Amino acid sequence: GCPRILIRCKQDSDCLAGCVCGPNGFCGSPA
Amino acid sequence: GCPRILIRCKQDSDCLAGCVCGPNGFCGSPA
Amino acid sequence: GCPRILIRCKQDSDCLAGCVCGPNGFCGSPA
Amino acid sequence: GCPRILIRCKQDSDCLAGCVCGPNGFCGSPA
Amino acid sequence: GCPRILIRCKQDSDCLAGCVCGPNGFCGSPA
Amino acid sequence: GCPRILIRCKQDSDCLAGCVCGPNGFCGSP
Ligand code: NA
Ligand code: NA
Numbered sequence: 591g592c593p594r595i596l597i598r599c600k601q602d603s604d605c606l607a608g609c610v611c612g613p614n615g616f617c618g619s620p621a
Numbered sequence: 622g623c624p625r626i627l628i629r630c631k632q633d634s635d636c637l638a639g640c641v642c643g644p645n646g647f648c649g650s651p652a
Numbered sequence: 653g654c655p656r657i658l659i660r661c662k663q664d665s666d667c668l669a670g671c672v673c674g675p676n677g678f679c680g681s682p683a
Numbered sequence: 684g685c686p687r688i689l690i691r692c693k694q695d696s697d698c699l700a701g702c703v704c705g706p707n708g709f710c711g712s713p714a
Numbered sequence: 715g716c717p718r719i720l721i722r723c724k725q726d727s728d729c730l731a732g733c734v735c736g737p738n739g740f741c742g743s744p745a
Numbered sequence: 746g747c748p749r750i751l752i753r754c755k756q757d758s759d760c761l762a763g764c765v766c767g768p769n770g771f772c773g774s775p
């Protein structure tokens with residue numbers, strides 16, 4: 591799954607492996 | 622999954638969620 | 653001390669060395 | 684530019700390269 | 715523009731914003 | 746002290762709070 595470090599993002603490729611960019615503008619797991 | 626950031630460790634609890642302290646003294650995925 | 657990177661957690665072992673999982677679900681110093 | 688990881692700071696040197704300490708005590712891009 | 719945190723990768727999307735996955739299997743700045 | 750995340754550095758200001766740029770070229774505890 592996605593690391594739980596808070597990282598702001600605008601798109602999914604901004605995030606670490608396993609993550610997508612959530613509607614809150616942070617990297618998160620895609621569940 | 623363990624995050625793939627390189628983190629030096631002594632013991633498993635030094636590591637982020639999903640990780641253990643591997644043979645080579647870095648955090649990594651179990652086995 | 654606990655590094656001042658914001659990381660969400662469920663239990664203490666989710667956090668980096670020096671940190672515990674606070675009642676707000678973020679890593680921090682046991683102080 | 685400053686990495687978009689949430690990191691608390693009291694002064695710019697607390698942050699990663701490219702970053703300054705913003706008005707709310709987190710690391711961010713200058714200006 | 716790539717943060718200088720050492721992160722191992724298999725593909726560019728594994729890396730933070732501004733980074734690509736070098737032939738070295740680490741996140742780094744592109745050309 | 747300093748987090749044990751590997752961060753490459755040229756100077757101390759490249760590092761997180763409590764850290765300096767050590768002779769190994771990485772941020773560490775002073
Ligand atoms: Na831990
Ligand atoms: Na710094």
Ligand code: NA
Nearest residue numbers: 603605727729
């Ligand atoms: Na990415």
